[PDB]
Amino acid sequence: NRTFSYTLEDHTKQAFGIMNELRLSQQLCDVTLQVKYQDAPAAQFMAHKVVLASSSPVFKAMFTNMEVVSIEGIHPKVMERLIEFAYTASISMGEKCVLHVMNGAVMYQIDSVVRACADFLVQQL
Amino acid sequence: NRTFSYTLEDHTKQAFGIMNELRLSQQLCDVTLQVKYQDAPAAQFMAHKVVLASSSPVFKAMFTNMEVVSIEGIHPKVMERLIEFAYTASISMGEKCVLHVMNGAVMYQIDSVVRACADFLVQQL
Description:
The structure is a homodimer.
Chain A: E1 3-7, H1 11-24, E2 31-35, E3 43-47, H2 49-55, H3 57-63, E4 67-71, H4 76-88, E5 90-94, H5 98-107, H6 111-123
Parallel strand pairs in A: 2-4
Antiparallel strand pairs in A: 2-3
Helix pairs in contact in A: 2-3, 2-4, 4-5, 5-6
């Protein structure tokens, strides 16, 4: 015909696969999240601002104006699981963490995780 | 149970949606592809190194070691469609461009597009 179009359905999933690898390799990272919560030991997470922005309106606003960002109000382990969700589309936690993850997900407006954690606590009743 | 897991299947697709918006807004971009081909006018494309790396082994190697990259051997219009594929998972072109796009896709080892363009030229016989 006049016009040839093509779509690879697995593409976004494959590309996030490689972006997650680059995050774990600490390649092309432009933000370090320095997480200090209460008496828990300080933890550091290197990430890509554009991936964090693509999964969180709070990160998008934060970065749209190698940066070090100071984060309070969230346990390192919850920030880790939120970052992993942003890079993987998957999150996992012990039943006793679901509340702390929902709290983290509301703070970073990751609405997908808020919904799933809320649906779980309600089912748990 | 002991362990609660969750996966949002549309997540990578939604996140690429927002990364494409940020590319069009020229937000968080860290590379400018300066494309000069023969007598065609010079064109500029701002992008995220990590998105280009996630869709092209050639971009990954290029950026893993605001940068201006000089690109020859490719028409601005083909580089545009390759960038759009990287941000959208979709590419479209007139039947008479399919060869020039395959050429571009081989140069940047976007294997998905090489395969689809090759399958089209062969079907066209």
